[PDB]
Subunit: 183 residues, 4 copies
């Protein structure tokens, strides 16, 4: 993309050490809309481009996680399908959850990328190696992030984030060559 080709020196550098990529759900994997039916059940919407991006990222050896303040079986099903290894729902204390996971995984903050959209993501965004916000994240989150995606949440922002990491790590060309003969 033009985003991976014009990726800043800073984001390219920050992408090098990444071993773990973490996503919030609402506003990142979705457009931030919450659909409710009369019985109180929810409908959730995700984006076709993001699944492909996450799959390519995982294939490159980067493990993935979701930390969400909300909880629904829709997300559990979505994550399992994609191959996301670590899912934490119903947690607004995102930093507490992250710390426990990094201790288990033996990783430092610099080895973590995170893509968020609102205030509860901020304590994590400020501390990780690659802390990014989607294009329509709360402006206060955008101002304190290392980078912002061109795409909006739920419209390929996760895909863009995945490709930034792949590109930073020298792995995007190989991922593309699976699909383009003589690339």
């Amino acid at each position: 993309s033009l985003e991976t080709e014009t990726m800043s020196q800073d984001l390219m550098q920050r992408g090098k050490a990444i071993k773990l990529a973490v996503f919030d759900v609402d506003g990142v994997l979705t457009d931030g809309r919450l659909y409710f039916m009369e019985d109180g059940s929810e409908i959730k919407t995700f984006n076709t481009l993001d699944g492909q991006g996450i799959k390519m990222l995982i294939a490159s050896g980067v493990t993935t996680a979701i930390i969400s303040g909300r909880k629904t079986a829709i997300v559990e099903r979505r994550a399992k399908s994609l191959g996301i290894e670590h899912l934490f729902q119903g947690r607004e204390d995102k930093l507490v959850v992250l710390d426990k996971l990094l201790a288990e995984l033996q990783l430092g903050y610099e080895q973590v990328a995170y893509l968020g959209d609102d205030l509860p993501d901020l304590p994590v965004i400020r501390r990780v190696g690659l802390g990014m916000a989607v294009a329509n994240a709360a402006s206060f989150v955008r101002e304190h992030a290392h980078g912002i995606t061109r795409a909006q949440g739920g419209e390929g922002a996760a895909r863009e984030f995945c490709e930034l990491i792949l590109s930073a790590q020298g792995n995007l060309e190989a991922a593309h060559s699976v699909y383009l003969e003589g690339h």
Copy 2:
């Protein structure tokens, strides 16, 4: 700045539902049951406004259990549905809270919101409100309804009252 001045005095913030907390779309299934959409940025904003001590209400000409549940999840204190005459509802609530019109902010989107918008301290329209409503409002949000308009309104009041910094500090330690 007129809007910031209007915001200082606010003690009650009032929202319409369809077109303000939602994008104005009404979803119906074949048996007539409804689906409605809200926005996560809005929820965070309303929670922060409420935590600052500004109380909140909804007044809507429609009625659905969907809205009752959403209001409770957000901690919206006062909910009135199925009400055509919004000024009548507001007047009664104001007597209960011992407030006047100047201490009320309202975020609306169509004609039945206008009798209220014109009379309160901070009467605002969403970006895609009916043009006649926008014409008569004190201000118009950049955001469309259901797309963070309510978040923007909440932050306007928080900021007018010197409370946005403290809301934000919770996340910056």
Copy 3:
């Protein structure tokens, strides 16, 4: 513009297609085959105001669903025809019954099946994202897209043409 205002004066019947005009043109299907449809609140208010001014309303759609019957009833739309591809035939029958001529009809459409009606009526308009061929042959095009207040815009155009919008707005300047 001044031509649309002129064409609006004579209107006694306003007719809508459903999908792409009162909706954004998305068709929602569930696994079990049933549908979901989305309408817009600004449009509802518009249609109610147009009806109150004395202009009757109708829907002619090629699709058929009980969702549309319910919506039409909620809004006070008097004449409803679904599952009808031959829109000009439907309209001609209705016009003979209401004793109205083409010049007294306004129609808001979005695709080719609407074109024969759009070309014959007094105020034949297309929504902003109607098929371009339809937009090219309509008397006018709404600024709003289908399902996003295009019907409201169309209703306000007719109310305005007849000098009735001012009064409809006036109610909402007063208190109770």
Copy 4:
């Protein structure tokens, strides 16, 4: 473009991906796992007119749902292949059966699994919001986004290339 008009002349089979082409790329899931999908009215009309002009149609999707089976039947799409991410393998088998060649195929895609087909066929096109790498390597890109009339635009490009759009429009001006 005159290049696209040229490529469109020989088309006898037009093939679509589903998600992101016939839809805006949103995947709706209810708590019980059942899905909802949205199609576009303008697209349905376009596909019906294409089929009427003599061009057969097909869908090849890496996902799989009865929703797509019903939508395909409603539009008269003859050849439907779901749950297939090896798209050239599917297409090769279909062409052998129909006795058609790559030069007679148009394909409208949105993401990487579509790219091998897009590169092989006579008219490989991407939707406006296709993955940028796919857009860069297609013959052409629709002005319209997926699920917002891109399929209609693609249908009309073929109809026009084959001198058939006027005649389709006529039914509506008599």
